[PDB]
């Protein structure tokens, strides 16, 4: 905990900006060294900056990301947000609806991220 | 951890429907008998149907609720959804934006629920 409810809304909106531009290195600097990511939730986790970097380089190396509603934030450093990811799959233009939950540490870095989505949230 | 992702989407949308109509009986029964709920997340857990039913008894005891986006569903019995609650803050109508994350058991009942929101999500 520590970042405020207001700080958490901003940190999370910023994360979506970076994904939308595709600035891979800025994204990764947002995560704690030790951060763990579960994306999609239900999969073995990604542990550490290095492994986390790999996901973004591979997934983000023509993708667009837009928040589709307000960031919901608590007072113990956690937040949840709904967004859409636009991409192209084998020529097929797709959109994926996702909801992510994040826990920030005292330095304002992402310690934990979990993403909720599956094929049922895939759209053409 | 057994309803399918499509089943999760349906269970969760039903729950918003019952909340909307105020069917407190039907809601409580959606929960496991020893389910735990954190609403708001950050607040200590209310446990077991009796305690959970008290939340809905008094909370919903001119409240409207509606999904404001698709229910995101995983493959391990978890789902997350964005919705808004409309109530009255003494005299004036306001709205609250919430995101809830739910885990279901083999019986299709809510074993856990976490509600993400704070004052930053309240608009008059
Ligand atoms: C990897 C991916 C692109 C980006 C992306 C996906 C899923 C969840 C995400 C969550 C994020 O916080 C940021 C980016 C993604 C997609 C799944 C299919 C695909 O092409
Ligand atoms: C109790 C309440 C009405 C309903 C409600 C609130 C907060 C979270 C909720 C989560 C639910 O899954 C269902 C209903 C609510 C509101 C807080 C202020 C208020 O009037």
> Rounded CA gap, B114 and B101, in Å?
5
According to the entry, how was the structure determined? X-ray
Return phi, psi of residue A19, to 5°. -75, -40
* Chain A / chain B CB contacts < 8 angstroms: 94
> Rounded CA gap, A3 and A76, in Å?
8
Q: Is B74 exposed, middle or buried (0-12, 13-18, 19+ CB in 10 A)?
A: buried
Nearest to A123 by CA among A86, A95, A88, A99: A95
B100: domain CATH number?
Answer: 3.10.450.50
Q: Which atom of ligand 1 is nearest to the CA of A89?
A: 20
User: Cα separations (Å) of A21 from A14, A81, A89, B54?
Assistant: 11, 18, 19, 46
A55: contact with B, CB 8 A cutoff: no
| Resolution, expressed in angstroms to one decimal | 1.9
Q: Which atom of ligand 1 is nearest to the CA of A19?
A: 13
Region class of B31: left (phi > 0), else alpha (psi between -120 and 50), else beta: beta
Total domains, chain B = 1
Pocket-testing residue among B54, B56, B63, ligand 2, by greatest number of atoms within 8 A of Cβ: B63
Task: Give the structural domain span for A61.
Answer: 1-124
Go through chain A and list every residue after which a break occurs, taking a C to next N gap over 2.5 angstroms, comma-separated: 61
Per the DSSP assignment, residues forming a β-bridge with A86 are A64, A95
> Rounded CA gap, B34 and B31, in Å?
8
Q: Please, which residues have CB within 8 angstroms of residue A38's CB and are 6 or more apart in sequence?
A: A45, A46, A113, A114, A115
Contact B72 A6 (CB under 8 A): no
Distance of CA B50 to the CA centre of its chain: 16
Q: Find the angle CA(B36)-CA(B42)-CA(B46) to the nearest 5 degrees.
A: 25
Q: Report yes or no: A1 and A76 within 8 Å, Cβ to Cβ.
A: yes
SS3 A54: helix
Region class of B50: left (phi > 0), else alpha (psi between -120 and 50), else beta: alpha
List, as one string, the DSSP characters of chain B.
--S-HHHHHHHHHHHHHHHHHT-HHHHHTTEEEEEEEESSBTBPPEEHHHHHHHHHHHHH---EEEE-SPPEE-SSSEEEEEEEEEEEETTEEEEEEEEEEEEE-TTS-EEEEEEE--GGGEE-
Q: Report yes or no: B44 and B56 within 8 Å, Cβ to Cβ.
A: no
Return phi, psi of residue A15, to 5°. -55, -40
Q: Please, which residues have CB within 8 angstroms of residue A120's CB and are 6 or more apart in sequence?
A: B5, B6, B9, B73
């Amino acid at each position: 905990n520590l970042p405020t409810a207001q700080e958490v809304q901003g940190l999370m909106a910023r994360y979506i900006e970076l994904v939308d531009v595709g600035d891979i290195e800025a994204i990764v600097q947002m995560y704690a060294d030790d951060a763990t990511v579960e994306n999609p939730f239900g999969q073995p986790p990604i542990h550490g900056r290095e492994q986390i970097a790999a996901f973004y380089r591979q997934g983000l190396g023509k993708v667009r990301a837009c928040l589709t509603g307000p960031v919901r934030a608590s007072h113990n450093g956690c937040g949840a947000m709904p967004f859409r990811v636009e991409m192209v799959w084998n020529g097929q233009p797709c959109a994926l609806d996702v909801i992510e939950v994040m826990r920030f540490d005292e330095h304002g870095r992402i310690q934990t991220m979990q993403a909720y989505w599956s094929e049922v949230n895939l759209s053409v």
